[PDB]
């Protein structure tokens, strides 16, 4: 992939860039709990067919 | 000043334009901040800006209105009021983004036998209410 930046093809001004990639680090991208299953149980009297 | 300088007598010059006044009440700089260009540490669009300098930073005179006993008041928006003003308006409509400061000079003379008082307010984000 061609590693270009805007100053390679247009005229630019000096900008002091404050933005960071902190929230898209692998850890931050995955740092959430996700539902993977729902298990059903009951508390009923066990009886010959169930 | 003992060489005549007065709070009431001013000359303002921007580009090819000069305003004189002999009856001012000093002048105001909103929030104590004089206009400035956008600094690199606060910059955001990365392309080279256009700065029209004297071509646009000059005094434009709008259509004169009339104050009478029945006048309730007038309003304007900036930059809207200047959208058709020479190269400022041109530079404005050719670009996606633009920023600008302003010297606003409201003019109204009368006589020592007239009376009346206009409040002239500059409001940041002057959102106005609708008719419905």
Swiss-Prot record, chain B:
Location relative to the cell: Virion; Host cytoplasm
Domain of life: Viruses
Subunit organization: Interacts with capsid protein VP1 and capsid protein VP3 in the mature capsid.
Protein's job: Forms an icosahedral capsid of pseudo T=3 symmetry with capsid proteins VP1 and VP3. The capsid is 300 Angstroms in diameter, composed of 60 copies of each capsid protein and enclosing the viral positive strand RNA genome.
Name this protein carries in UniProt: Capsid protein VP2
Portion of the full sequence shown: 74 to 205 of 2209
